[PDB]
Amino acid sequence: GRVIRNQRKGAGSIFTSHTRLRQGAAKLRTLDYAERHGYIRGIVKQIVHDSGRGAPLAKVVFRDPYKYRLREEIFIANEGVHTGQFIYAGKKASLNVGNVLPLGSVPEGTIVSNVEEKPGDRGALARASGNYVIIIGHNPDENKTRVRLPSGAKKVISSDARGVIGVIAGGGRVDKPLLKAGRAFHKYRLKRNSWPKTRGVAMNPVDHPHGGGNHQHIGKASTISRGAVSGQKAGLIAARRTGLL
């Protein structure tokens, strides 16, 4: 048989991301003495757009303490920040939107974004548009902190891990229909080559497990296993269930 599309996706010839017009990798400030003990102030200069991304970014300028110079970080903007705003980042920072704090300092019930799975990760969770995590409780002994993620899962992580207050901007982006193939074309033009998607049923047997037949059908049971391997995993990888909910 042939090698199939998902197997070809791993080499990364024509499936690499399209990264020319991206403003830069969005990240939090590196964990330093200031963020660990007190706070530090920066100025948000520009609220800007990032190609291939629905959420906007913010350019935040901070003052290097060890040398006389300026350092520009690229944050993911939360809903409500504005140019000329002061962003306070650290342990002793106040509880306002856009500020960066550790999860142990804040109380439970608060809303944060761009959370680090571990301290020094510089942003892992709640980065897409309209997304947020909710702190539900702390455990100061054994220092840990329990959070709820956008998928609904509940996790426990270090209280020294950081996050930025508020909701990521750009919400509602998926409530608008596209109505046209051209808008999907231009959307994925800047993300990657995962569009259009031909159906495996419409191919020959060399090209897919689902291919073949005088009628467009699958010969079996679209729930594949998890111990399957590299050419068998067509659809519904490890389905605990199927059907409408």
Binding site: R146, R148, P150, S151, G152, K154, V156, R240, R241, L245
Partner: protein, 431 residues
């Protein structure tokens, strides 16, 4: 996914089984719903009547409770608090209503109790008191005659679940405290003379076959069943002692008195005429196979057979094959002579057919293989007449009798039949 997670239980339980210190509020959010649901369930095509249902569509409340019961039964071990009364709620949901619950919910609770007993949350001593009372209630004849009562299916489910329970309990070592307790309920069911010992016999046979209840205490139960008045209980006992018999005969307390009581109660005593022929024959088989094996003496058997020993009678080849099985070396051969002379008068007489004569001779020679001095030389010769009979049934039959008496009493045979070694043995031993 977050808003749908409360609706998706299969993902919730896999998440809870990982980190159950989290997902406390997610569990309370469902336990409250389960409580509010059980608090509810606690309490035709004609032109006139309301339309009926197909039997497979259900309510959205029941479809939710059936899911919540499984979720709570699978995470009770993670949340021992807030679930301590859950199995008692299930138990008093079952054995106080029995009827305001749909069959799917009943089945779900019955399986959740079984897995809650597989895990050591619940004990067998309190699961038995849930399972047994439902059998008698769904074998009621008044509960099983609704519109869509699933009484037969429930009676099968509870039965196989009891079997799984006892198989579970008797794996490592035999839980005598449990077996001795649930044999007492079989005894106390067989007392109730209507039909309720069915669920004792049908269960003890299964456990004997699975080898879980090899004990002297159990064979007494089936003895009492065989000595019962109900036909479908007596038959269960008889077919147990049959299954050629099984090792249970070697755990009886008095086989002779057992056979005597059987022959007196069922067949001869009152002549109630309850059993049909197909059951009378199975009783005869048991009696004769006990008798021949254990050297018993009743002497009424051998006149009871004579009514039925006629070729114009229904399925006589089974009766006469049990006639021989009640013969010995140690019984008065006159009461068997009358039997042999009935058979000879009615099966190898004038004009009879080939199959009839062959059946007669074949069932006489296998009598004489146990009771050799039960027919005399004068009729022995009359029957070895039929050696060269041209029919190939009677010849094969007569040769068997000749070879039987060639090794046992060859002087009854004539010189023509003593085959080269019986005659030589007689010639040396006659001088």
């Amino acid at each position: 996914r977050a808003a749908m997670l409360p609706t998706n239980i299969i993902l919730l339980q896999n998440l809870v089984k990982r980190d159950p210190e989290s997902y406390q509020e997610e569990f309370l959010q469902q336990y409250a719903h389960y409580e509010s649901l059980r608090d509810i369930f606690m309490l035709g095509n004609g032109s006139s009547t309301m339309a009926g249902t197909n039997g497979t569509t259900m309510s959205t409340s029941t479809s939710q409770l059936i899911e919540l019961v499984g979720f709570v039964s699978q995470v009770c071990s993670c949340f021992p608090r807030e679930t301590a009364n859950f199995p008692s709620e299930l138990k008093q949901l079952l054995l106080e209503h029995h009827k305001s619950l749909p069959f799917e919910l009943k089945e779900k609770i019955l399986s959740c109790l079984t897995m809650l007993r597989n895990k050591d949350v619940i004990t067998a001593e309190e699961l038995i008191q849930s399972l047994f009372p439902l059998l008698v209630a769904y074998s009621s004849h008044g509960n099983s005659l609704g519109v869509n009562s699933h009484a037969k299916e429930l009676r099968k489910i509870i039965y196989t679940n009891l079997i799984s329970l006892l198989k579970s309990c008797n794996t490592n070592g035999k839980n005598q405290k449990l077996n001795k307790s649930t044999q007492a309920v079989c005894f106390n069911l067989l007392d109730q003379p209507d039909s309720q010992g069915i669920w004792a016999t049908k269960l003890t046979r299964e456990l004997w076959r699975r080898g879980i209840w090899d004990d002297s205490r159990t064979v007494e139960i089936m003895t009492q069943a065989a000595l019962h008045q109900d036909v479908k209980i007596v038959m269960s006992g008889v077919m147990f002692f049959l299954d050629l018999n099984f090792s249970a005969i070697h755990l009886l307390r008095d086989p002779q008195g057992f056979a005597e009581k059987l022959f007196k109660e069922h067949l001869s005593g009152k002549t109630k005429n309850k059993f049909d022929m197909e059951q009378k024959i199975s009783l005869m088989q048991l009696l004769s196979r006990l008798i021949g094996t254990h050297k018993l003496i009743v002497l009424g058997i051998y006149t009871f057979f004579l009514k039925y020993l006629t070729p114009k009678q229904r399925d006589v080849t089974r009766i006469m094959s049990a006639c021989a099985q009640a013969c010995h070396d140690l019984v008065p051969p006159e009461v068997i002579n009358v039997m042999v002379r009935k058979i000879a008068d009615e099966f190898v007489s004038d004009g009879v057919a080939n199959e009839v004569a062959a059946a007669g001779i074949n069932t006489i020679r296998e009598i004489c293989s146990r009771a050799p001095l039960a027919i005399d030389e004068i009729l022995l010769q009359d029957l070895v007449e039929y050696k060269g009979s041209k029919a190939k049934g009677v010849n094969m039959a007569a040769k068997s009798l000749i070879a039987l008496y060639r090794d046992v009493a060859p002087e009854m045979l004539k010189k023509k039949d003593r085959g080269k070694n019986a005659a030589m043995e007689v010639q040396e031993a006659k001088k």
